[PDB]
Write a protein that binds this ligand. Structure first.
Ligand SMILES: [Mg+2]
Ligand SMILES: [Mg+2]
Ligand SMILES: [Mg+2]
Ligand SMILES: [Mg+2]
Ligand SMILES: [Mg+2]
Ligand SMILES: [Mg+2]
Ligand SMILES: [Mg+2]
Ligand SMILES: [Mg+2]
Ligand SMILES: [Mg+2]
Ligand SMILES: [Mg+2]
Ligand SMILES: [Mg+2]
Ligand SMILES: [Mg+2]
Ligand SMILES: [Mg+2]
Ligand SMILES: [Mg+2]
Ligand SMILES: [Mg+2]
Ligand SMILES: [Mg+2]
Ligand SMILES: [Mg+2]
Ligand SMILES: [Mg+2]
Ligand SMILES: [Mg+2]
Ligand SMILES: [Mg+2]
Ligand SMILES: [Mg+2]
Ligand SMILES: [Mg+2]
Ligand SMILES: [Mg+2]
Ligand SMILES: [Mg+2]
Lengths: 77, 149
RNA sequence: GCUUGACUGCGAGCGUGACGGCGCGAGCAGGUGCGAAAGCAGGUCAUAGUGAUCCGGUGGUUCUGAAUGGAAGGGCCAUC
RNA sequence: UGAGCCUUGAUGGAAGUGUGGACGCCAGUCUGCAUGGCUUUAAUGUUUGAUGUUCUAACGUUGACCCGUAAUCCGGGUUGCGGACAGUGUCUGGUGGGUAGUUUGACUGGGGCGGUCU
RNA sequence: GUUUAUUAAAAACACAGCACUGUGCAAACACGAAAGUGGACGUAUACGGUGUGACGCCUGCCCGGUGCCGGAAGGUUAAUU
RNA sequence: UUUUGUAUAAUGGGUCAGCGACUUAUAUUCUGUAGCAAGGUUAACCGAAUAGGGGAGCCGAAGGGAAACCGAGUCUUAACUGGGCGUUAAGUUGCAGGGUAUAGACCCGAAACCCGGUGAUCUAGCCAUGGGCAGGUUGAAGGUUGGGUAACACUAACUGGAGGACCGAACCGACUAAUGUUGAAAAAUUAGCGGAUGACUUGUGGCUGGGGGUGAAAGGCCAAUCAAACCGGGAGAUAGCU
RNA sequence: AGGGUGACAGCCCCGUACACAAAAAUGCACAUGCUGUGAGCUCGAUGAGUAGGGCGGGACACGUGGUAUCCUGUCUGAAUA
RNA sequence: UAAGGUGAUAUGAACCGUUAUAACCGGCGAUUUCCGAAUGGGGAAACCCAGUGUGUUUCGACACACUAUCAUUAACUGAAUCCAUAGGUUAAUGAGGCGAACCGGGGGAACUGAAACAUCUAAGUACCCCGAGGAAAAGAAAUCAACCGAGAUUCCCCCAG
């Protein structure tokens, strides 16, 4: 479901609008890559379909901090 | 990405030091394996003391007991005989295994392993310089008096 | 031969156009040229030699300028 | 290997005696290595850009195992392989009747052709 | 053999044979936003695409133009800095 | 009706009876008419609801200049001249009508374009599983014996039974003519005709869905529809034409 | 008011204004009971992958325009009264 | 509430009533087959088959009840692997589907107009999809104003074509 999962960044729509300004309904899908995060504490290697930058989050706002939430919302985890 | 080292690590090791690194190294190796910890502040600006409990507290005023320095100066006179005789000479010798045990019945006691002496005075009788230094820095002084049985 | 009137601002009143426009213009103001002088000169003997608006470009200007002073930008005049 | 920093030279302990380098407008002189009565330009420390190697630890695996599981899917684990490559996101040059929307004037002794639009 | 069911059965299409070209396998390619699937439970004596059309004797000259294949040393050149 | 022009052999109407096309809203400008007048008038809203209150605001009594600004003047200009636009114009608010704007804008009518659904009981390919092919003919390969060979080739007779093989019912198809053409029939009947063990033919069910499918390819077939199916919407598409 | 009754009825009938009517069931207001909720008093704390920025788009009447402001797919990324 | 009644085409029949529920009007409950979210499994809708209990029984066979899925929680279990998770079981509570318009959100046309047509318009309209309520959304300034101040949101009339 091409979803950030960690931030929710979903694919938005738009227009390629080539030169001369021409309607070309397209879409912008997240980076995403899915990783193998080492919770360490829980001693588990939970793999999440995280998106670029959205990763910088786990590496900044905290792993189990994020894993905390997402798990509170009732997401896979 | 800073993170504090925790062991080896090539061109950046200190078993405990903060060095700028790439996130591609952390959460990928430097960490997931037990070799570092992010600059979560909670381990730096809140662990500064912890990561400094051997200098700012120890190595600067560490008086745990290193008072055995000058400690020796006013005692029962460090007169350690050595059996004298023969036209005014001696018999045995005095060095360490005598100055230290000297404080046997004196309750206290010093370690013959803690002293200072350039060379070794031959057979004489003059006060020795068996200075009892509790620690390299804070040393002391100790004498010897080859008495007669 | 001497020159820059191929000037600037306006214009009684006319001609020709459905209109946008276009042509003729004596004379008035300021300042020029030529002539002794009256006077002539607002491009060529005349009728072809041509592009509207928009969007912009360059110069000028206390016209304007979103809290105020500025500025960008906008208007006006010249011009591509 | 470029570029950088500027960290160190060159202008701008005792003589002699020799051993490689320097551009010179040369008849040079220098420059170090042993023996012996601030610019102008290069090296180490360093930073960053280039290409190229090697590694593992992301990442791939439509190799082999183990459990879920008397399952061919899938997930987790093990091992091998490959490995910052491949792949994907955003941006970007090329290509692109495969596809899509349109255009492709008027006069005209019918239309077209020819010619003509001021 | 096939074909315009309802005006054309043919000299049309198809064929076996031929050549060219692509494809090393998670194949090329095709359907599909993706997962996945056909190709194929096949592996270059295989599969796809194109053109020719049994068989016999053959298949000449042209690479200037367009396409495609190889080189990319140099000239011009995108985002970016 | 349409036309320069129609009895026109140009259009439309069998006839009758009923229905059938310049409306509606808001705005703007006039004409008429009513109210008030240098003033006219309210909006929403309130409401002892068609009153009464509310004058937010709108138009008008001033205009010129691109404006700043000025002002019965103001611009243009250096110009205290001329010239342009102004000054000696009553407006305003209803109500009825004419006209315009925005709306489907008198009415009926395309061929098409887009969006979402429904269809492979017809037909085109395919997948799975079953069925059909009277009779008659030809005679390949291979084998057996004789011959033959140094052994093989080779050869003859018999055997054997292949083939998008032959003749021909069923069956599948559809080359010719006639008849039919308000048919018996929205493609057939009759007399001939082509294939008929094959790329054959058929029952049953399944899978491919519209710019997509399927196609031994004709633009053919996708339910009597196909150079883009059918149904429902956008939708009163649009129609300088009739 | 209206309707019906053998033609058009205030007084024939049903109604009509007006006046009352609830075992029970519930909308709604209040009123309170139980549980859950937590008042106010001082001392505090005051929303970071965020605001901004580069790229591509979109929304703002506003077609990038000299164009603020808002949202972001992609890359970054601060102050902290 | 009452002298009349057993709905209609529908009479007839056979009956119930006349003080006091006969009928009839409303409140509340009972029953409420089978299909249909359909929920035990399956399926061409209204049908075919099953398990575990229960029952009758001179206790067979057959009636009846519960058995979908997901989710939150609790309990018991429990792999690769010591632990540990994964997974399994059970229980309870909730969801599921139906809807007329209005509403919030995700996606989003063309005809048309521009007297052609790409910018532009049509229009964020038609349509599709998810979600919620009697309303929804919105809402207590990182708002405007302009040196005076106003004071969350929402709807109306002006500003003004
Ligand atoms: Mg001339
Ligand atoms: Mg085309
Ligand atoms: Mg169009
Ligand atoms: Mg023409
Ligand atoms: Mg044939
Ligand atoms: Mg035909
Ligand atoms: Mg035929
Ligand atoms: Mg051919
Ligand atoms: Mg041929
Ligand atoms: Mg040839
Ligand atoms: Mg005529
Ligand atoms: Mg006429
Ligand atoms: Mg006639
Ligand atoms: Mg009639
Ligand atoms: Mg045959
Ligand atoms: Mg026949
Ligand atoms: Mg035959
Ligand atoms: Mg069938
Ligand atoms: Mg429409
Ligand atoms: Mg119509
Ligand atoms: Mg059931
Ligand atoms: Mg079921
Ligand atoms: Mg048009
Ligand atoms: Mg204030």
């Amino acid at each position: 479901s091409r979803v950030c999962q960690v931030t929710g960044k979903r694919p938005v729509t738009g227009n390629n609008r080539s030169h001369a300004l021409n309607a070309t309904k397209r879409r912008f899908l997240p980076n995403l890559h899915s990783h193998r995060f080492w919770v360490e504490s829980e001693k588990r290697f939970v793999t999440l379909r995280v998106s670029a930058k959205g990763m910088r989050v786990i590496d900044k706002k905290g792993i189990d901090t994020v894993l905390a939430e997402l798990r509170a919302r009732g997401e896979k985890y | 990405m800073q993170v504090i080292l925790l062991d080896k690590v090539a061109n950046l090791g200190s078993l405990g030091d903060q060095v700028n690194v790439k996130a591609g190294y952390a959460r990928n190796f430097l960490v997931p394996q037990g070799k570092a910890v992010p600059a979560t502040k909670k381990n730096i600006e809140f662990f500064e003391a912890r990561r400094a409990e051997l200098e700012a507290k120890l190595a600067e005023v560490l008086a745990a007991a290193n008072a055995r320095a000058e400690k020796i100066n006013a005692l029962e006179t460090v007169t350690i005989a050595s059996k004298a005789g023969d036209e005014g000479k001696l018999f045995g010798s005095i060095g360490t295994r005598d100055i230290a045990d000297a404080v046997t019945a004196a309750g206290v006691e010093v370690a013959k392993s803690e002293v200072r002496l350039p060379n070794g005075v031959l057979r004489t009788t003059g006060e020795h310089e068996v200075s009892f230094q509790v620690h390299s820095e804070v040393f002391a002084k100790v004498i010897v008096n080859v008495v007669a049985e």
